[PDB]
Amino acid sequence: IIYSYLEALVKVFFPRKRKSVAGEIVLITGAGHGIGRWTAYEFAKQKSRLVLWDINKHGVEETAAECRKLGATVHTFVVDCGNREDIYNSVKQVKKEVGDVTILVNNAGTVYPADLLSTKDEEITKTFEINILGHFWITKALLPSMIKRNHGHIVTVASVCGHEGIPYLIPYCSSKFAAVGFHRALTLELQALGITGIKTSCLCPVFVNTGFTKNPSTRLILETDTVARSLIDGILTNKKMIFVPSYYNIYLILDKFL
C-alpha cells in the first residue's frame, strides 16, 4: 500500500530505460503452459525469434501456434530440461536449425508437495534436476556464444520460495534457494570476468494461479498474464531481482529484522 504508491511515483519521475529484444533468439523452457507460455506471448509481441522447450509436446505446439498468430517466428523442441544428455543434444539441434540463443529463460519447474517424511526420494531428485541442475546444463551450453559476442541475457525463474521457506515444500524451497544462488553467483562472476554485455534477471513471484500447486501457502491471487508482463518489463529494463508483486521485497526485508 505504502510501497505501491511510492514505487508508481518513482517509475514516472525516475523511469528505467527499455531496451529492444526484436530479432533476439529467445529460448524459453517450460513454455507449454503457465508462466512459460505467457512469457512466450510477451516475447512474440516484442518481435523476438522464439525457441520453445517442454516435455509436453501438445502444449508447446499450442503455445507456438498462438505466438505465430502474434507475428513471431517459432521453433519447438520436446526437451526434458532435467536431463543433461537431452539438453546438450537439443542445443546441437537449436544451433543447426535456428542459431545462437541470445536470451535464455530457465522457467521449467516441478514440485511434489508433502511433509519431509512423506516425500519420495525420486521426487526430491527430480525437483533438483529440473529446478536447478538443468539451469546449469542449459546455461553452460548457451553461455559461450553470448561471451564470444559480449551479448546475452540469463533469466532464472525462481519463486518467493527462493527467499523464504514454506511448510510441506522443503525440497522445492531448497531447489528454489539454489536457483536464487545460481543467479547471484552468475551475476557476480560475469562482472568479475569483465563480461559487461550479459545481463541476468531472477523472477520471484508469489502464488500464481497456473495449477502448479492447488492453493497459496498463506492468507494471500496473481494471474499468469500479470507475471509475464512483470517478467518482460524487468528484462527490458535489466532488473536483476524481479518480485511479483514488487512490494514483497519489503516483507522479506522485515523478516531479516526480528
Ligand X SMILES: NC(=O)c1ccc[n+]([C@@H]2O[C@H](COP(=O)([O-])OP(=O)(O)OC[C@H]3O[C@@H](n4cnc5c(N)ncnc54)[C@H](O)[C@@H]3O)[C@@H](O)[C@H]2O)c1
Ligand Y SMILES: O=C(O)c1ccc(NS(=O)(=O)c2ccc(Cl)c(Cl)c2)cc1F
220 binds, among ligand Y, a copy of itself, ligand X, none (CB under 5 to 8 A by kind): ligand Y
145 binds, among a copy of itself, ligand X, ligand Y, none (CB under 5 to 8 A by kind): none
Residues that bind ligand X (CB under 6 A): 29-30, 32-36, 54-56, 59, 80-82, 107-110, 130, 157, 159, 205, 207-208, 210-213
| 208 known ligand binder | yes
| 108 known ligand binder | yes
Q: Kindly determine how many residues on this chain lie close enough to bind a copy of itself according to the rule CB under 8 A.
A: 52
Interface with a copy of itself, residue 116, by CB under 8 A = yes
How far is residue 170's CA from residue 97's CA, in Å, rounded to a whole number? 40
172 as an active site residue: the answer is yes
Q: Give me the amino acid identity at 43.
A: F
CA distances from 89 to 53, 55, 81, 160, 256 (A): 13, 15, 11, 32, 43
Interface with a copy of itself, residue 188, by CB under 8 A = yes
Other CB atoms within 10 Å distance of the CB of residue 249: 17
218 binds, among ligand X, a copy of itself, ligand Y, none (CB under 5 to 8 A by kind): ligand Y
- Which conformational region is residue 155 in: left (phi greater than 0), alpha (psi within -120 to 50 degrees), or beta? beta
Interface with a copy of itself, residue 162, by CB under 8 A = yes
Residue in 170, 210, 238, 245 binding a copy of itself, rule: CB under 8 A: 170
| 147 known ligand binder | no
Angle at 83 between CA 99 and CA 191, to 5 degrees: 60
Question: What are the start-end ranges of the H helices in 132-223?
Answer: 134-149, 170-192
DSSP secondary structure of 12-79? HHSPPPPPP-TT-EEEEETTTSHHHHHHHHHHHHTT-EEEEEES-HHHHHHHHHHHHHTT--EEEEE-
Choice between 214 and 256, CB closer to a copy of itself: 256
Burial (CB < 10 A; 0-12, 13-18, 19+), residue 246, is middle
| 103 known ligand binder | no
Residue in 81, 173, 204, 208 binding a copy of itself, rule: CB under 8 A: 173
How far is residue 62's CA from residue 65's CA, in Å, rounded to a whole number? 5
Burial (CB < 10 A; 0-12, 13-18, 19+), residue 17, is exposed
Interface with ligand Y, residue 212, by CB under 6 A = yes
List, as residue ranges, the binding site: 35, 54, 80-81, 107-108, 172, 176, 208, 210
Q: Could you tell me which residues are annotated as the binding site for NAD(+)?
A: 35, 54, 80-81, 107-108, 172, 176, 208, 210
The set of catalytic residues is 172
Residues near a copy of itself, by CB under 8 A? 84, 115-117, 119, 121, 124-125, 128, 132-133, 136-137, 139-140, 143-144, 147, 161-162, 164-171, 173-189, 191-193, 252-253, 256-257
